[PDB]
Amino acid sequence: EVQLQQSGPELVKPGASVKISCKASGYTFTDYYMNWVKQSHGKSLEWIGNINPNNGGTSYNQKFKGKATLTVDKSSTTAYMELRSLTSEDSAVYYCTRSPVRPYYFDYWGQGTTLTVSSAKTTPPSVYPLAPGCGDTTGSSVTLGCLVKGYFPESVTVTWNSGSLSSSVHTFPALLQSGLYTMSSSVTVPSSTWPSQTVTCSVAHPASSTTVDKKLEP
Amino acid sequence: GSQGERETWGKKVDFLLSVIGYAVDLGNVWRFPYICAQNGGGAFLLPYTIMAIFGGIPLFYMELALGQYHRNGCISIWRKICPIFKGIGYAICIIAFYIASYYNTIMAWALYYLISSFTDQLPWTSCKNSWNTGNCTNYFSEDNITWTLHSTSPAEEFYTRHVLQIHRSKGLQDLGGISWQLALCIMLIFTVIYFSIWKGVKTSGKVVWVTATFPYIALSVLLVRGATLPGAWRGVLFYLKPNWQKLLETGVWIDAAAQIFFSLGPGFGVLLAFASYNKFNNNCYQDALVTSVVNCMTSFVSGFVIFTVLGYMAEMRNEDVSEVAKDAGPSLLFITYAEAIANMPASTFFAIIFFLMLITLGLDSSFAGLEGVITAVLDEFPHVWAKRRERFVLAVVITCFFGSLVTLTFGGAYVVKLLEEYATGPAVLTVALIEAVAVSWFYGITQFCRDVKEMLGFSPGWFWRICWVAISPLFLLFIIASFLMSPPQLRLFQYNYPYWSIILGYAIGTSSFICIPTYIAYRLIITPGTFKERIIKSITPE
Amino acid sequence: DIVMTQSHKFMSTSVGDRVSITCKASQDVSTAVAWYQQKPGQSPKLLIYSASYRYTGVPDRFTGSGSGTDFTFTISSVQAEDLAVYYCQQHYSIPRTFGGGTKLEIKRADAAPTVSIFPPSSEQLTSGGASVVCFLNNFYPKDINVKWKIDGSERQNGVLNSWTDQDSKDSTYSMSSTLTLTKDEYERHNSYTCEATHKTSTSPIVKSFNRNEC
Ligand SMILES: CC(C)CCC[C@@H](C)[C@H]1CC[C@H]2[C@@H]3CC=C4C[C@@H](O)CC[C@]4(C)[C@H]3CC[C@]12C
Ligand SMILES: CN(C)CCC[C@@]1(c2ccc(F)cc2)OCc2cc(C#N)ccc21
Ligand SMILES: *[C@@H]1O[C@H](CO)[C@@H](O)[C@H](O)[C@H]1NC(C)=O
Ligand SMILES: *[C@@H]1O[C@H](CO)[C@@H](O)[C@H](O)[C@H]1NC(C)=O
Ligand SMILES: CCCCCCCCCCCC
Ligand SMILES: CCCCCC
Ligand code: NA
Ligand code: NA
């Protein structure tokens, strides 16, 4: 049960600073190096630096010297990384990963932390239901779906009936336009469960902390 | 008169190998390869020579000439040059007492490592010992093993917890008490140096025959051994890989200068004493040139001797030779290299000849080290001393032994670092600067060139004169200023030195040359007449 | 520093085929190469360490080989859930660098795109807008044309195509064509129609609906 739980998404204006946490469990925290890997959108992994939890023995990368600052707390077994002078390039997904001294592999990773560096205002998402017409042909399966328009940044989660069931859910990637994102979701459910039971799509926006739920109606 | 003339050398080759044996030591083996690897690689060869030709060689030759000309000790020679600077001859003495406090103890370790290498199975191979912890993980064990932040190797465990026993101390604060084993070892060493000095230059020219010739043989064996090891090309590559961007840094030049200073060991009076016992018409140029050219070459091949083995070690592990060579100290020899030796056929052999090599690397250098001081005191206090030489030499050796008991403690290595980097070093550089200034700007460089013109039959070239006049004192001045402006942060065995360490080091350092200004004040307060007349009797030879 | 170069940014394979990814390093590495697997939307997962050795909790189908500068990660039996981006990484010199990444796409038989058109909801009409949606589900490959028709006329403005990543169950792509329009313009037209042209059939799939209360 080696688990590495990081902090949530962060939306910060350029020039400011941001701190990311990393709570470790399931292993002896004082036994392994704690690392931080930066992954840009569509790019490769990029090792920032490590830190020795025993004494805080940091080892940064030359590319990140003066860019990132690593700290550690043994009292709660939690690592931290601070970034100052934030720019558009810093807008990426950051991981904190465990690693031994030798051989230096990254055995366990964190779930990641989506960082968005922009001065754009936190816009709440508009949730509009996408119900099939009353003139459509009900076959062996009906396809439902929900639409999300206008929100910032890329931090949204669309679930279906508390994650049950979702064995045919198709989620479409968000598209950015005029500083606002727009995405959509669909689900293929048989005709023997609609509209008999209750099917409700949930749209959560952690950046604006807004959760809107909409039920499909033919 | 009661006594007329002093003794001489038994043979040219004897002292020719004596000075070389003193120049060559531990530092030649492991310090130069490391500092050469991390400062431009092969490109470090360029500033290393420049700091030699302009800095090292002129000081070496200038030091070697005065001794063979005046034939006086480190103390009595100033009475014939600049009496007020006579304190120099005393300062060095005190300096020596500090140096001998640790420089021998190192050898002790090797000795303790040598007497433990007579077993068919070397102690630092297995983990089933009385000093190893539960962290001890060795090879010929389960595969797939993965190293941990707290994990240690049986070699590291053997050095740390057995011989050095540094786990029994919390630092400089609490280091007591003394280990009796290394005490017996250092007693054996203080005994083997006694019988090589007590009879004078007669034995110190004969004992050197073995101590100075053995390391080259052993280095040859280790060379042809390490060359046959698989993946040894990595260490050589890392050893010679040119990093010309390092030459732009003003640091590596200072590193080279300091390095070439300490390897040469001028300005200490040892070369003065060795030169004292020699033919008057004997050549000084060729002697100085040859010896030095060796002290360096020897460093150069020693580099291969180390990096082939470390390359093999990086091959057996997983690369980046810097990782296996992170620690820059005795641990590179006592842990890394030793652990590399343990994993080779005929390990007992390659261990014995290696530690024996270390000991012989140290003694010869330790022979002279005492030899210079003894010569100085005997020449300063003649016929009140020399009643027997064995008495005085014994009186020195025992004193050095009691002075080394602080280093024989559990937290002794800490003291070694502290004394070697914060105390003795900058003081030797300082007194070397004082000598370089005194001979060139007080006694006169012209008269010196005239003395050389008397000995060699011809006046030294402009290339050397211009070096003694300006290049050398600035050469030392640069190093001294570089150190004093930013003393290095000391670290040893996962232990950072306290902030007050520099205060203690400087305290020990300053207490060494308290004698020169107070002696200047002594003669200045003793000599009657005007202060200008006193300084005139202090500037003019006696 | 060290440059881990993956020449092939993308590689195609089928379910059950043998696939191998190459990794080129700057200098000689001996046997210090690690292979990580990163599924779309998840964190990287260590599969191979030290050239050939497998990590704990890794299936037998994942292997590793190589010794020097060129290294190879081999998969014997490709599964639908093996769909991920694979990375190689050196672990000898500081700093630790990674490869470009090889996105392993799965090749299979063609599939007919289930097209489904959807009328603007009343909740969107309340705010004062209307977007007709055209979903394209379960097809292969990714290359597919989408043409819109408001009232027989080819609509091209206000159309957004969104392609998802490949599927990890049946390996089928899916896309969404969105036609965003105003309420005023929406209430001036009745029957919308979206059509899709794929390689499965020469005749484009046509879906249509009426605004007059379906
Ligand atoms: C050889 C003589 C002349 C040197 C004496 C200089 C004095 C002032 C120096 C030398 C050693 C130094 C001490 C070294 C040890 C300690 C213990 C530490 O917990 C407080 C600082 C303290 C107390 C230092 C204070 C300053 C100190 C006492
Ligand atoms: C220079 N060559 C390599 C020998 C080194 C040994 C050394 C030496 C001097 C007195 C002794 F009793 C024993 C040994 O000679 C001079 C010297 C200066 C410093 C400084 N700072 C440190 C050590 C020594
Ligand atoms: C191993 O080392 C750690 C710290 O280095 C120490 O806490 C632990 O007690 C050691 N193990 C044993 C069995 O002594
Ligand atoms: C591999 O090494 C690790 C070191 O932590 C160990 O936990 C693991 O059990 C080893 N693998 C096997 C199969 O024993
Ligand atoms: C590299 C220096 C070897 C000798 C170390 C002695 C400490 C004093 C040196 C001060 C100048 C660096
Ligand atoms: C200037 C050196 C001062 C040292 C104090 C002991
Ligand atoms: Na030397
Ligand atoms: Na020697």
Q: What is the DSSP string of A80-146?
A: EEEE-S--GGG-SEEEEEEE-SBS----EE---EEEEE-----PPPEEEEEPPPTTS---SEEEEEE
Cis peptide before B474 (omega within 30 of 0): no
Question: Do residues C174 and C137 touch, judged by C-beta distance below 8 A?
Answer: yes
For residues B222 and B82, give the distance between their C-alpha atoms in angstroms, rounded to a whole number. 48
For residue C208, what is the enclosing H or E element?
Answer: strand C205-210
Ligand 1 shell residues, CB under 6 Å: B 173, 500, 503-504, 507-508, 511
Q: Contact at 8 Å (CB) between A166 and A145?
A: no
The amino acid at B125? T
**Do A101 and B317 lie within an 8 Å CB cutoff?**
no
Could you give phi then psi for residue B75, rounded to 5 degrees? -105, -50
Residue B342, CB-side half-sphere exposure with 13 Å CA sphere: 26
The verdict on A182 touching C (C-beta cutoff 8 Å) is yes
Residues of chain A positioned with their CB less than 8 A from the CB of C43: 95, 109-112
Q: Tokens at residue B483, please?
A: 């150190």
Are C137 and A170 inside 8 Å of each other by CB?
yes
Distance from CA of C69 to the nearest CA of B (A): 13
**B319 contacts C32? CB cut-off 8 A:** yes
Closest CA to C86 of C48, C142, C140, C29: C48
* Sequence-ordered list of residues with C-beta below 8 angstroms from that of C121, at least 6 positions apart, any chain: A128, A129, A130, A131
Distance B216 CA to ligand 7 centre (A): 14
CA B136–ligand 3 middle distance (angstroms):
10
Q: In this structure, what token pair is assigned to residue A7? A: 């902090």
Question: Chain C contact for B174, CB < 8 A?
Answer: no
> Which amino acid is residue A197, in one-letter code?
Q
Q: Which fold has domain A1-119?
A: Immunoglobulin-like (2.60.40)
Ligand 8 centroid, distance to B10 Cα (angstroms): 20
**Residue contact B146–A30, C-beta within 8 A:** no
- Cα–Cα distance, B38 to B44 (Å, whole number): 9
B3 in contact with A at a CB cutoff of 8 Å?
A: no
Q: In this structure, which long-range contacts are made by residues C37-40, counting pairs with CB atoms below 8 Å and at least 24 apart in sequence? A: C37/C84, C37/C85, C37/C86, C37/C87, C38/C84, C38/C85, C38/C86, C38/C87, C39/C83, C39/C84, C39/C85, C39/C168, C40/C83, C40/C84, C40/C85, C40/C165
* Helix/strand/coil for A9: coil
Pick the CATH number of C109-211 from 2.60.40.10, 3.30.2130.10, 2.70.170.10, 3.40.50.10490: 2.60.40.10
Query: Which segments of chain C belong to CATH 2.60.40.10?
Result: 1-108, 109-211
Q: In what order do the strands lie in the sheet with C85-90?
A: C10-14, C102-107, C85-90, C33-38, C45-49, C53-54
CA–CA distance, A14 with B108 (Å, rounded to integer):
61
The DSSP 8-state label assigned to residue B467 in this structure reads I
Write out the two tokens for B363. 């003694």
Q: With contacts defined as CB-CB under 8 Å, which chain C residues touch B315?
A: 30
* Segments in B193-284 forming alpha helices (H): 208-211, 214-228, 233-240, 250-264, 270-276
Cross-sheet strand order for the sheet of C70-75: C19-24, C70-75, C62-66
Q: Roughly what angle, to the nearest 10 degrees, separates helices B424-441 and B445-455?
A: 80
With CA atoms as reference, the chain C residue closest to A63 would be C95
Between chain B and chain C, the number of residue pairs with CB atoms below 8 A apart is: 21
Cross-chain residue pair B323–C31, CB shorter than 8 Å: no
Give the Cα separation of B61 and B289 in Å (integer): 8
Sort B539 into a burial class: Cβ within 10 Å, 0-12 / 13-18 / 19+. middle
Q: Is the CB of B483 under 6 A from ligand 5?
A: yes
Q: What is the CA radius of gyration of chain B?
A: 24
| Sequence-ordered list of residues with C-beta below 8 angstroms from that of B280, at least 6 positions apart, any chain | B68, B69, B455
| Ligand 2 cavity residues, CB under 6 Å | B 22-23, 25, 96, 99-100, 103, 263, 265, 268, 270, 365-366, 369-370, 424-425, 428
* Residue B27 Cα: closest atom of ligand 5: 3
Domain boundaries, chain B: 1-542
Question: Could you tell me if C46 lies within 8 Å of chain B, comparing CB atoms?
Answer: no
Q: Which residue has the tokens 């019988």?
A: B195
Of B47, B186, B179, residue with least CA distance to B110? B186
Closest to B33 measured CA to CA, from B266, B221, B305: B305
Query: Which two tokens mark B421?
Result: 């980097």
Residue C201 in contact with partner chain B when CB distance is under 8 A: no
Rg, chain A, Cα only: 21
Report the residue among B144, B149, B151 best suited for mutation to probe ligand 4: largest number of ligand atoms under 8 A from its CB.
B144
CATH class of A120-215: mainly beta
Helix H or strand E segment including B448? helix B445-455
Resolution of the coordinates in A? 3.2
Instruction: Identify which of B172, B174, B503, B511 to mutate to test ligand 1's pocket (most ligand atoms within 8 A of the CB).
Output: B503
* Nearest chain C alpha carbon to A184: C176
Q: Which residue puts its alpha carbon closest to atom 5 of ligand 3? A: B150
Q: Is A126 on the interface with C (CB under 8 A)?
A: yes
Separation between Cα atoms, residue C95 and residue A37, nearest integer Å: 12
Distances (CA, A) of B447 to B79, B381, B499: 17, 27, 47
Which of B430, B503, B504 most suits a substitution to test ligand 6, by most atoms within 8 Å of the C-beta? B503
C26: tokens are 């700057």
Query: Nearest CB to C43: which of A61, A62, A109?
Result: A109
Name the residue of chain A whose CA is nearest to C132's CA. A130
Q: What are phi and psi of B385, to 5 degrees?
A: -110, -175
- Cis bond upstream, residue B473 (ω within 30): no
Question: Does B488 contact ligand 3 (Cβ within 6 A)?
Answer: no
Residues 94-113 of A with CB under 8 A from B: 100-103
Report how far Cα A200 is from the mean position of its chain's Cα atoms: 23
Contact residues for B9 (Cβ-Cβ < 8 A; gap 6+): B15, B201, B205, B277, B278, B279
Ranges in chain A annotated CATH 2.60.40.10: 1-119, 120-215
Is C28–B323 a contact, with Cβ atoms under 8 angstroms apart? Answer: no
First to last CA, chain B: 20
Gyration radius of chain C's alpha carbons: 23
The CATH label, of 3.40.640.10, 2.120.10.30, 2.60.40.10, 3.90.550.10, for the domain at C1-108 is 2.60.40.10
Helix (H) or strand (E) holding B306: helix B285-316
* Both structure tokens of B372: 């210079």
C163 strand-pairing partners: C175
Ordered alpha helix ranges (H), B76-213: 76-79, 87-99, 103-114, 154-158, 180-192, 208-211
| Residue B315 touches chain C, beta carbons under 8 Å | yes
